[PDB]
Amino acid sequence: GEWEEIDIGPFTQNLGKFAVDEANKRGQYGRLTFNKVIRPCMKKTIYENEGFREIKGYEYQLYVIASDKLFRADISEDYKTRERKLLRFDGPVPPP
């Protein structure tokens, strides 16, 4: 089980804000207005495959409501620099 459901608290809500912010720069859905992240928020941890198998970072799967539409966002997050990248942002997706 590489995936782990995490809370949808302020940190996760801000992850959804990052997703909508990046989705707006992408422009695939035009200007979106972040509303909230809903359950479930899944986090997968990515490890070094060599040595002490340290954590490279994380990838999240978020269901983000933006402009009254439900989107599925996938975000990578580096472990050391916390720099985040929007991997995928698809919608409208069915309610999870």
Side-chain angles (χ1 to χ4, degrees), residues 2 17 20 30-31 34 48 54 73 77 80 86 92:
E2 217 61 53
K17 298 191 200 183
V20 177
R31 186 97 200 161
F34 173 82
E48 301 302 332
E54 313 214 338
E77 166 175 302
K80 294 183 173 179
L86 182 59

PDB file of all heavy atoms in Angstrom, residues 2 17 20 30-31 34 48 54 73 77 80 86 92:
ATOM      1  N   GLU A   2       1.211   1.715  -1.196  1.00  0.00           N
ATOM      2  CA  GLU A   2       2.017   2.921  -1.329  1.00  0.00           C
ATOM      3  C   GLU A   2       1.213   4.191  -1.090  1.00  0.00           C
ATOM      4  O   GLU A   2       1.790   5.214  -0.707  1.00  0.00           O
ATOM      5  CB  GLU A   2       2.662   2.967  -2.716  1.00  0.00           C
ATOM      6  CG  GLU A   2       4.069   3.536  -2.721  1.00  0.00           C
ATOM      7  CD  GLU A   2       5.033   2.720  -1.887  1.00  0.00           C
ATOM      8  OE1 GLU A   2       5.127   1.492  -2.099  1.00  0.00           O
ATOM      9  OE2 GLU A   2       5.687   3.309  -1.003  1.00  0.00           O
ATOM     10  N   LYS A  17      -5.374  24.473  -3.442  1.00  0.00           N
ATOM     11  CA  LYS A  17      -5.165  25.826  -3.950  1.00  0.00           C
ATOM     12  C   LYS A  17      -3.995  25.867  -4.917  1.00  0.00           C
ATOM     13  O   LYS A  17      -4.063  26.529  -5.960  1.00  0.00           O
ATOM     14  CB  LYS A  17      -4.918  26.802  -2.801  1.00  0.00           C
ATOM     15  CG  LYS A  17      -6.052  26.935  -1.816  1.00  0.00           C
ATOM     16  CD  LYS A  17      -5.805  28.110  -0.884  1.00  0.00           C
ATOM     17  CE  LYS A  17      -6.629  27.999   0.382  1.00  0.00           C
ATOM     18  NZ  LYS A  17      -6.435  29.184   1.268  1.00  0.00           N
ATOM     19  N   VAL A  20      -5.240  24.364  -8.188  1.00  0.00           N
ATOM     20  CA  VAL A  20      -6.059  25.274  -8.982  1.00  0.00           C
ATOM     21  C   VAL A  20      -5.214  26.417  -9.527  1.00  0.00           C
ATOM     22  O   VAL A  20      -5.399  26.850 -10.672  1.00  0.00           O
ATOM     23  CB  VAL A  20      -7.247  25.789  -8.150  1.00  0.00           C
ATOM     24  CG1 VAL A  20      -8.057  26.801  -8.944  1.00  0.00           C
ATOM     25  CG2 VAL A  20      -8.124  24.627  -7.732  1.00  0.00           C
ATOM     26  N   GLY A  30      -9.780  27.143 -18.450  1.00  0.00           N
ATOM     27  CA  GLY A  30      -9.938  28.557 -18.225  1.00  0.00           C
ATOM     28  C   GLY A  30      -9.696  28.882 -16.762  1.00  0.00           C
ATOM     29  O   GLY A  30      -9.195  28.071 -15.982  1.00  0.00           O
ATOM     30  N   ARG A  31     -10.077  30.102 -16.398  1.00  0.00           N
ATOM     31  CA  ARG A  31      -9.908  30.564 -15.027  1.00  0.00           C
ATOM     32  C   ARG A  31     -10.804  29.760 -14.093  1.00  0.00           C
ATOM     33  O   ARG A  31     -12.031  29.767 -14.235  1.00  0.00           O
ATOM     34  CB  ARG A  31     -10.228  32.053 -14.926  1.00  0.00           C
ATOM     35  CG  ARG A  31      -9.936  32.655 -13.554  1.00  0.00           C
ATOM     36  CD  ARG A  31      -8.582  33.345 -13.520  1.00  0.00           C
ATOM     37  NE  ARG A  31      -8.078  33.518 -12.161  1.00  0.00           N
ATOM     38  CZ  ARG A  31      -6.807  33.742 -11.856  1.00  0.00           C
ATOM     39  NH1 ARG A  31      -5.875  33.825 -12.791  1.00  0.00           N
ATOM     40  NH2 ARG A  31      -6.461  33.887 -10.579  1.00  0.00           N
ATOM     41  N   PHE A  34     -10.742  28.256  -6.835  1.00  0.00           N
ATOM     42  CA  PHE A  34     -10.656  27.195  -5.845  1.00  0.00           C
ATOM     43  C   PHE A  34     -11.778  27.324  -4.829  1.00  0.00           C
ATOM     44  O   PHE A  34     -12.014  28.402  -4.278  1.00  0.00           O
ATOM     45  CB  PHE A  34      -9.305  27.238  -5.136  1.00  0.00           C
ATOM     46  CG  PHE A  34      -9.205  26.287  -3.979  1.00  0.00           C
ATOM     47  CD1 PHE A  34      -8.905  24.953  -4.188  1.00  0.00           C
ATOM     48  CD2 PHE A  34      -9.419  26.727  -2.684  1.00  0.00           C
ATOM     49  CE1 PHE A  34      -8.817  24.075  -3.125  1.00  0.00           C
ATOM     50  CE2 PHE A  34      -9.335  25.855  -1.620  1.00  0.00           C
ATOM     51  CZ  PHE A  34      -9.030  24.529  -1.840  1.00  0.00           C
ATOM     52  N   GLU A  48      13.969   6.736  -2.673  1.00  0.00           N
ATOM     53  CA  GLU A  48      15.171   6.242  -3.325  1.00  0.00           C
ATOM     54  C   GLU A  48      15.058   4.733  -3.482  1.00  0.00           C
ATOM     55  O   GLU A  48      14.579   4.044  -2.580  1.00  0.00           O
ATOM     56  CB  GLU A  48      16.410   6.582  -2.485  1.00  0.00           C
ATOM     57  CG  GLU A  48      16.637   8.064  -2.205  1.00  0.00           C
ATOM     58  CD  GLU A  48      16.773   8.897  -3.461  1.00  0.00           C
ATOM     59  OE1 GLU A  48      17.221   8.357  -4.492  1.00  0.00           O
ATOM     60  OE2 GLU A  48      16.434  10.099  -3.415  1.00  0.00           O
ATOM     61  N   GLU A  54      15.897   6.580   1.016  1.00  0.00           N
ATOM     62  CA  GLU A  54      15.355   7.818   1.554  1.00  0.00           C
ATOM     63  C   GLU A  54      14.165   8.280   0.721  1.00  0.00           C
ATOM     64  O   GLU A  54      13.968   7.859  -0.421  1.00  0.00           O
ATOM     65  CB  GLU A  54      16.411   8.925   1.569  1.00  0.00           C
ATOM     66  CG  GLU A  54      17.779   8.545   2.119  1.00  0.00           C
ATOM     67  CD  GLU A  54      18.443   9.691   2.861  1.00  0.00           C
ATOM     68  OE1 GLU A  54      18.071  10.856   2.609  1.00  0.00           O
ATOM     69  OE2 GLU A  54      19.374   9.434   3.650  1.00  0.00           O
ATOM     70  N   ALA A  73      -6.883  16.245  -9.125  1.00  0.00           N
ATOM     71  CA  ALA A  73      -5.561  16.821  -9.278  1.00  0.00           C
ATOM     72  C   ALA A  73      -4.529  15.856  -8.724  1.00  0.00           C
ATOM     73  O   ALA A  73      -4.776  15.168  -7.729  1.00  0.00           O
ATOM     74  CB  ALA A  73      -5.458  18.167  -8.558  1.00  0.00           C
ATOM     75  N   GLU A  77       5.547  16.544  -4.873  1.00  0.00           N
ATOM     76  CA  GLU A  77       6.145  17.438  -3.888  1.00  0.00           C
ATOM     77  C   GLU A  77       7.496  16.876  -3.492  1.00  0.00           C
ATOM     78  O   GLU A  77       7.571  15.756  -2.981  1.00  0.00           O
ATOM     79  CB  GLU A  77       5.249  17.593  -2.656  1.00  0.00           C
ATOM     80  CG  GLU A  77       5.944  18.235  -1.461  1.00  0.00           C
ATOM     81  CD  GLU A  77       5.003  18.477  -0.295  1.00  0.00           C
ATOM     82  OE1 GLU A  77       3.998  19.196  -0.480  1.00  0.00           O
ATOM     83  OE2 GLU A  77       5.268  17.950   0.806  1.00  0.00           O
ATOM     84  N   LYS A  80      12.878  17.429   0.000  1.00  0.00           N
ATOM     85  CA  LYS A  80      13.860  18.331   0.590  1.00  0.00           C
ATOM     86  C   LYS A  80      13.552  19.802   0.330  1.00  0.00           C
ATOM     87  O   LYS A  80      13.741  20.638   1.221  1.00  0.00           O
ATOM     88  CB  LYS A  80      15.258  17.986   0.072  1.00  0.00           C
ATOM     89  CG  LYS A  80      15.754  16.622   0.531  1.00  0.00           C
ATOM     90  CD  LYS A  80      17.171  16.344   0.054  1.00  0.00           C
ATOM     91  CE  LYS A  80      17.705  15.055   0.656  1.00  0.00           C
ATOM     92  NZ  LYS A  80      19.083  14.750   0.183  1.00  0.00           N
ATOM     93  N   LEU A  86       2.227  20.484 -10.427  1.00  0.00           N
ATOM     94  CA  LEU A  86       0.962  19.885 -10.824  1.00  0.00           C
ATOM     95  C   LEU A  86       1.234  18.839 -11.895  1.00  0.00           C
ATOM     96  O   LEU A  86       1.747  19.160 -12.972  1.00  0.00           O
ATOM     97  CB  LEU A  86      -0.006  20.945 -11.342  1.00  0.00           C
ATOM     98  CG  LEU A  86      -1.385  20.406 -11.735  1.00  0.00           C
ATOM     99  CD1 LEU A  86      -2.056  19.743 -10.544  1.00  0.00           C
ATOM    100  CD2 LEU A  86      -2.266  21.504 -12.313  1.00  0.00           C
ATOM    101  N   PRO A  92     -14.707  17.605 -15.466  1.00  0.00           N
ATOM    102  CA  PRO A  92     -15.270  17.197 -14.173  1.00  0.00           C
ATOM    103  C   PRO A  92     -15.249  15.686 -13.959  1.00  0.00           C
ATOM    104  O   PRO A  92     -15.622  14.926 -14.848  1.00  0.00           O
ATOM    105  CB  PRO A  92     -16.713  17.708 -14.240  1.00  0.00           C
ATOM    106  CG  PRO A  92     -16.678  18.789 -15.262  1.00  0.00           C
ATOM    107  CD  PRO A  92     -15.697  18.320 -16.285  1.00  0.00           C
TER     108      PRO A  92
END
